[PDB]
């Protein structure tokens, strides 16, 4: 006969609650747990793994393997641009990578980003390139002089065939929305530095690859529902 007082919100079903409930199978003893390699404990281990990014997402190479590489020409003698993408973690074309796919389940993000490039050409072929990052608040650069005035790295190909640059975290606040709308986070571009030189009787073109992964300060919060998948009809049983 203990007197009690009922508070508002009783009897409701909240999806994200945490309460204990009686079991339907008393005295049941589950199977023992053997050791299996490859146990994942946090989602941040997945985000620290490189994956290719579809740079060449035009209509011609829409469903093939040609969308992951970009071609270089040796007939060009000028400081020209090769490609340019946005650095927003959840925007195209890098929204479909591993880190992009995982980030679509949250709303806020922070930390730095790491980009890697690999050169796939003949061992007798040499080139020099320039990779630059542009902080927000200004239009996209159109000439090498404007691109140089910023965070940039100069790459020379040799015995090693991979380079890695980082995009520092530069923002007014501490977090950013994974779906920004009208705001941006900057651009990254690539330009010819000197030329692409080949010996006689050699293919006159070369390919390139790009990877992306998160640095040691990457983080996510405020989990939500992803927007990269949908169910139109009904799944057949």
């Amino acid at each position: 006969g203990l007197p009690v007082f009922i508070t508002p919100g009783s009897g409701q079903f909240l999806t994200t609650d945490d309460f204990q409930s009686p079991c339907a199978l008393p005295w049941y003893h589950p199977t023992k747990e053997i050791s299996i390699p490859g146990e994942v404990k946090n989602l941040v281990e997945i985000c620290q793994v490189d994956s290719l990014v579809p740079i060449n997402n035009t209509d011609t190479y829409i469903n093939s393997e040609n969308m992951y590489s970009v071609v270089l020409q040796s007939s060009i003698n000028a400081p020209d641009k090769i490609f340019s993408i946005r650095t927003d973690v959840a925007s195209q074309p890098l929204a479909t990578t591993l880190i992009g796919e995982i980030s679509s389940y949250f709303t806020h993000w922070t930390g730095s980003l790491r980009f890697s490039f690999m050169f796939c050409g003949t061992a007798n072929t040499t080139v020099k390139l320039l990779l630059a990052y542009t902080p927000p608040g200004i239009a996209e650069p159109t000439t090498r002089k404007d691109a140089m005035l910023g965070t940039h790295v100069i790459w020379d190909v040799g015995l090693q065939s991979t380079i890695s640059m980082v995009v520092p975290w530069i923002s007014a606040s501490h977090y950013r929305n994974t779906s920004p709308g009208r705001s941006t986070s900057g651009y990254i571009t690539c330009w010819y530095q000197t030329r692409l030189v080949i010996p006689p009787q050699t293919p006159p073109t070369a390919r390139l690859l790009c990877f992306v992964s998160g640095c040691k300060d990457f983080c996510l919060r405020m989990a939500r529902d992803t927007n990269l998948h949908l169910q139109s009809g009904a799944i057949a049983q």
């Binding site: 730095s112 542009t134 902080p135 927000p136 608040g137 200004i138 650069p141 404007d146 691109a147 005035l149 910023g150 965070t151 520092p168 975290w169 530069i170 923002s171 007014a172 606040s173 501490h174 300060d217």
Partner: protein, 251 residues
């Protein structure tokens, strides 16, 4: 006493009759600590080449004036090294020091209100579904003066209701904001020192205005002399300025 002397960079200001000085919210300006930092790149501190005194264009005070207002850091958008650094970077923060000078004779009478308002969001002039244009909130060093003649683009101009603080709050309650008075029979100067206030450690300098300066004549100017129009001058000095995120020039 009535004497004051301030030296910021290579410039010095003196005055022989003032009324103390105001430190906004009792906090002195300083740099950014590592406990609150967000960006990871190293900031740039121009030091003495930017923390100096800049003087704006003067205005005329007559018997029919109504008021004026400015915005910061929009007013110093082209003042040498400070403007160049503001337009070459992406983030920045700084403090300020404001000095207002206006002198008259011993046969004049009048009073002014000098106030500094944070996040002063003004209201529109017309009714319906309208808003305020970008060009009319960034007038540069000339500032804005309340007048009566018809202006262009009526659907983008702000309101002229000076007695409503330009935003729907009664004048006379403005004393909560850091403020000072100028009484022609007592003093001819005002000094306010303001730190950096915001909800984020650092922010874009071309899309956000932290502070605003408002001058309102509460008592009309009246005299029997032949000098019936008096000028007003304003000088501003950045304190502890630093920038980050270098790129190409926005302009």
């Amino acid at each position: 006493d009535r004497i004051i002397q301030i030296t910021r960079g290579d410039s010095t200001i003196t005055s022989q009759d003032v009324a103390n000085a105001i430190v906004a919210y009792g906090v002195w300006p300083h740099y950014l600590s590592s406990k609150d930092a967000s960006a990871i790149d190293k900031p740039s501190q121009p030091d003495t080449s930017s923390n100096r005194f800049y003087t704006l264009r003067s205005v005329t005070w007559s018997s029919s004036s109504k008021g004026w207002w400015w915005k910061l850091p929009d007013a110093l958008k082209d003042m040498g090294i400070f403007g160049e650094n503001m337009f070459y970077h992406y983030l920045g923060r700084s403090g300020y020091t404001i000095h207002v000078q206006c002198n008259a004779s011993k046969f004049h009478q009048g009073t002014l209100i000098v106030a500094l308002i944070p996040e002063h969001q003004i209201a529109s002039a017309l009714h319906g579904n309208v808003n305020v244009g970008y060009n009319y909130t960034h007038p540069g060093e000339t500032g804005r003066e309340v007048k009566a003649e018809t202006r262009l683009n009526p659907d983008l101009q702000p309101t002229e209701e000076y007695w409503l603080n330009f935003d729907g709050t009664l004048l006379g309650n403005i004393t909560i904001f850091p403020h000072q008075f100028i009484n022609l029979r007592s003093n001819n100067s005002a000094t306010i020192i303001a730190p950096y206030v915001n909800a984020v450690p650092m922010d874009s300098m071309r899309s956000h205005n932290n502070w605003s300066l408002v001058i309102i004549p509460i008592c009309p100017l009246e005299t029997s002399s032949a000098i019936n129009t008096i000028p007003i001058t304003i000088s501003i000095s950045p304190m502890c300025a630093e920038f980050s995120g270098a790129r190409a020039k926005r302009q």
